[PDB]
């Protein structure tokens, strides 16, 4: 399995943000004793995106100029990656 790392949707008109990502699921059955689930939302990463989101929350909520990021389809939403902390 390999999907996109979690991102942040940001609405420019209303300045309304929120994290998002692909979360897999599967039919529930017995678990495994010798296995602690790895990082399935941000695959092959040490899970730093939580820290990056925590640090970027103050900036995003304060207000950010989203003209420098790609749009989503034809709507007023833009994607901000969480591969690195956001400082602007």
């Amino acid at each position: 399995m390999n999907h996109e790392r979690p991102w942040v949707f940001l609405n420019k008109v209303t300045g309304k943000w929120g994290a998002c990502g692909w979360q897999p699921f599967w039919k529930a059955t017995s678990q495994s004793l010798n296995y602690i689930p790895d990082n399935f939302i941000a695959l092959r990463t040490n899970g730093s995106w939580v820290r990056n989101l925590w640090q970027s929350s103050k900036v995003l909520d304060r207000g950010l100029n989203a003209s420098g990021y790609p749009t989503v389809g034809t709507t007023d939403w833009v994607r901000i990656p969480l591969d690195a902390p956001l400082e602007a």
Binding site: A28, Q31, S32, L33, I36
Partner: protein
């Protein structure tokens, strides 16, 4: 033959998992010398290590020469019971006068601030982490226990739970005996009704 191992150095297997290095687990990717040698750079640490190493060599040489070339004026042979491998330790760990009490109180205050509360918080984290490891459908966390559990001592439990239960059981026993005998036979002491 496949991938035969070369040598017999330690490998983490089912029979052995080794002794964890908590210091490296916690201080991962962070230096330790800012805490053990505050304010010193690598060159200063190395220079200090060299100086102290030479000094220790000199002191060790002096001490060995002294102990190995001193005349014996007295011989001290401690008293022990027969069949005993080693003499009893003459050191006591209990304060005797008030000055020792004050000294041990100061030591206890320091240890509490600097060695005991850290242990307590580490253990609390370990317990919560074990809960998290067993959570999520892997194990039986949350099936019983919790902080709302009512824990009673042996005396309290036996006095307030066991004896009343047996009392109720005895009363139920007598009442059921009488009611069942009446129900079947229709009398209390005369066997079947309208027959005898």
């Amino acid at each position: 033959l496949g991938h035969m191992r070369v040598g017999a150095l330690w490998q983490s297997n089912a029979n052995s998992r080794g002794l964890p290095n908590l210091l490296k687990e916690v201080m991962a990717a962070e230096p330790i010398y800012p805490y053990t040698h505050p304010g010193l750079s690598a060159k200063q640490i190395l220079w200090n290590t060299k100086f102290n190493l030479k000094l220790e060599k000199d002191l060790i040489s002096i001490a060995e020469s002294a102990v190995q070339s001193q005349t014996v004026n007295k011989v001290v042979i401690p008293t022990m019971l027969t069949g005993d491998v080693n003499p009893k330790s003459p050191a006591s760990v209990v304060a005797k006068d008030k000055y020792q009490l004050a000294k041990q109180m100061a030591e206890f205050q320091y240890k509490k601030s600097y060695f005991e509360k850290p242990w307590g918080y580490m253990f609390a984290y370990y317990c919560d982490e074990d809960r998290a490891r067993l959570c999520g459908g892997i194990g039986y966390v949350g099936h019983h226990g919790g902080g709302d559990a009512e824990i009673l001592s042996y005396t309290e439990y036996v006095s307030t739970v066991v004896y009343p239960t047996i009392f109720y059981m005895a009363i139920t026993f007598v009442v059921s005996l009488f009611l069942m005998y009446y129900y079947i036979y229709g009398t209390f002491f005369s066997s079947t009704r309208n027959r005898f």
